[PDB]
Symmetry: C2
Subunit: 263 residues, 2 copies
């Protein structure tokens, strides 16, 4: 069944390229300087950037809040990209509909963190499909809770990126996260774990072929699921503090409804 | 890196685990499944049976201090086991402390599952059994402090690991290079890689019909991280209400900075 696992890997890779706007391969070429992105490193350059590139999300006048909301806006788009990707995972669309919704609902946060790392290095993050680059130092220097909200994402990414996965590896890894049988409220766990078993087999073979010199990479990647679960838990606690503290967060009730899953 | 060496390592750890830990899973299962007159536990299911049990072998506090006493002993046993893990004692001394400090709680949960089924837990080296319903009915924060241990154990025990599997699994946990404050991660990760290879082959040989058991076991390391986090929090909240609780200096130290 090696050929079947390879077939599965290729299927997911092809779908991953169609679903997501910027691949890790492209993001690394931009970050390493190999079409030069506009750089946001302070308030003035932010203002010029939104006037020149017109980074979508601009509707509170306060910068820190506008950047925070920009993150939420992009994460809503990512949810729809991940949802579409999921539909391409063999067996997924055949699951109970309620279980499809549960899997996506409890998976998307972990997947967004994972894929965010593809767009990050130790110095900052790509935005607008790699047309902009916003510096870590600028994000961290935002006031109040906002600075401290941004920095944990970079800390995770720097560590995740040390595994040096590529898109073909990530396509399978993301699938493994979606098909987690331990999500709350699942109706029929067995078929979910059967599909995950296939994906885990596929990921194992993919990592042995693609990184033969990298010993126990499979195991190291699964251990990252521990850091993912933890940071998502922290994320929720940080969001709640912000919600209780900040009165100037007010959007139109219809935007709030659009963002309800993320805020 | 070569099979025969991986099997040699599995045997080494299993042998050391038997020496370090008084009550194996194999012994616990023979007691729990019964059909043996000699090994039958006295069962504590209420206040009266507790009173008779002390003659034979505040309530919530006494039970709590029972759990705490055993946990301290477990730390001691785990520490002794850790020294047998090849390479561990050769590490920087600060890193040895750090690995134990963050590792013991995860191991205690894991090994406590060996002593549990869905109806209760073995105590007093298997001479006693205390019911889950009795523990959960303890007052105040204490009831809800007991129950999560059982909820984990029921799930972990579904994997049907035996002691030879657990010996390697526990060693993997201890040699975690992602602990906070580690000075030299590389030598830790080198040992862990060896243990992971040993675990993978152990599981393939011992559970050949159990697909991706390796991966499913590593996924349990995630559940451990979260439950230990919740444990610490709940223990802190209890500390602030209850002055009638003392923690052994060893546990006290482990909890300082979590
Ligand atoms: C720097 C940072 C911090 C928190 C962050 C994020 C980035 C992002 C984010 C995620 C996915 C992409 C993607 O292109 O694939 C892009 C993202 O930012 C782009 C961005 C950066 C700066 C200003 C505007 C827009 N999300 N985010 C979150 O806080 C977040 C995360 Cl990691 C997961 C789930 C939900 C959220 C959020 F909704 F609360 F934002
Ligand atoms: C059921 C339960 C709940 C919380 C628990 C525990 C059990 C235990 C515990 C752990 C290891 C053994 C071991 O034989 O190997 C035994 C243990 O109980 C035995 C026991 C049960 C009932 C009455 C008296 C004694 N500890 N425990 C804790 O709350 C605990 C844990 Cl899991 C880890 C560290 C510290 C603690 C404690 F200090 F807070 F107790």
């Amino acid at each position: 069944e090696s050929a079947d696992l390879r077939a599965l890997a290729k299927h997911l890779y092809d779908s991953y390229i169609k679903s997501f706007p910027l691949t890790k391969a492209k993001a690394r070429a931009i970050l390493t300087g190999k079409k030069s992105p506009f750089v946001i490193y302070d308030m003035n350059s932010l203002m010029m950037g939104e006037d020149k590139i017109k980074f979508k999300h601009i509707t509170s006048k306060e910068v820190a809040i506008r950047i925070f909301q920009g993150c939420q806006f992009r994460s809503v788009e990512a949810v729809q990209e991940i949802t579409e990707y999921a539909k391409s995972i063999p067996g997924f669309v055949n699951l109970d509909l309620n279980d499809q919704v549960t899997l996506l609902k409890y998976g998307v946060h972990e997947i967004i963190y994972t894929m965010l790392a593809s767009l990050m290095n130790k110095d900052g993050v790509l935005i607008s499909e790699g047309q902009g680059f916003m510096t870590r130092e600028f994000l961290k220097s935002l006031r109040k809770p906002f600075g401290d909200f941004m920095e944990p994402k970079f800390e995770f990414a720097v560590k995740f990126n040390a595994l040096e996965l590529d898109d073909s590896d990530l396509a399978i890894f993301i699938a493994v996260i979606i098909l987690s049988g331990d999500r709350p409220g699942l109706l029929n766990v067995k078929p979910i774990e059967d599909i995950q078993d296939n994906l885990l087999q596929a990921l194992e073979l993919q990592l042995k072929l693609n990184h033969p010199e990298s010993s126990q990479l499979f195991a190291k990647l699964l251990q990252k699921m521990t850091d993912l679960r933890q940071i998502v838990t922290e994320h929720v606690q940080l969001l709640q503090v912000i919600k209780k503290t900040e009165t100037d967060m007010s959007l139109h009730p219809l935007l709030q409804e659009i963002y309800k899953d993320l805020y």
